[PDB]
Amino acid sequence: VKPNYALKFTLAGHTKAVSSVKFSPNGEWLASSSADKLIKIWGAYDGKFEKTISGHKLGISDVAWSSDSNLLVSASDDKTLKIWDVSSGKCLKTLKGHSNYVFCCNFNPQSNLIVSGSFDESVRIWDVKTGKCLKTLPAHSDPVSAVHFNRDGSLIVSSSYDGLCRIWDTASGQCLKTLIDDDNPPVSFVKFSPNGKYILAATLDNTLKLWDYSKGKCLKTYTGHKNEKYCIFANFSVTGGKWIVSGSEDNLVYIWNLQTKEIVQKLQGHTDVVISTACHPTENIIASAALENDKTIKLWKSDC
């Protein structure tokens, strides 16, 4: 079994590199963030432009949706995070506290909290209602590349250029586990599996690794792609066949069989590094976005 992802739409509009694409939990929309300081909303099924959301003073590295699809959070080079009302496009809160670029962000499932990672090497936990910083974790010794809550929001996983993956207890702010491997190459991306039992981690040695973080064992390795410079988003594709999806520095979207580790498809079309990929919550749809020499978002559809 192999998917047959085929190009459906090319979404043009960003004037600089696209940095992150995410599907709304309700599947109706795709949100994109960019170095052009804008957040754009698109129709997930027709690729139709919906609206531009603005307010950040500098480029945005990440955007994330709340569980009800009503809010977005964005992480910017301006050292802040902003919480946006999607329907109005209005900035509800500006989260201030990071002392360097904000790189990654996510809401917890309950969506009362936001987790952020910054070049300031810290991980911050924010209260959505007040915009107050609840906890500052001295998480890593280098820029924090990714932060993600697990399925029940009890845990946060963070990754850094320091070569470590750390699992944190959300309520206590304490570090539960540190994952180290080989010679500690920079960790460019991390996220929990949908069941929260595993973590998918990308390293700048052209490798993706599936970890059983509690047992501290690497179960699978995904290679063949190019990843030595950028913090490229990777995903678990679960709507059809069980795949691992990632962008690559060779301008391709890579799709591996989760179990066998074999490359099942390479999606050609982008003209620059595919920095971000996202998997649709209900349909076999992939959104992919590329850097400065491309600046577009592509929507791909598969039968499986």
Binding site: L58, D77, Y161, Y230, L291
Partner: peptide, 9 residues
Amino acid sequence: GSARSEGYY
């Protein structure tokens, strides 16, 4: 630019 689009050095 943005920190993510700049990349690692």
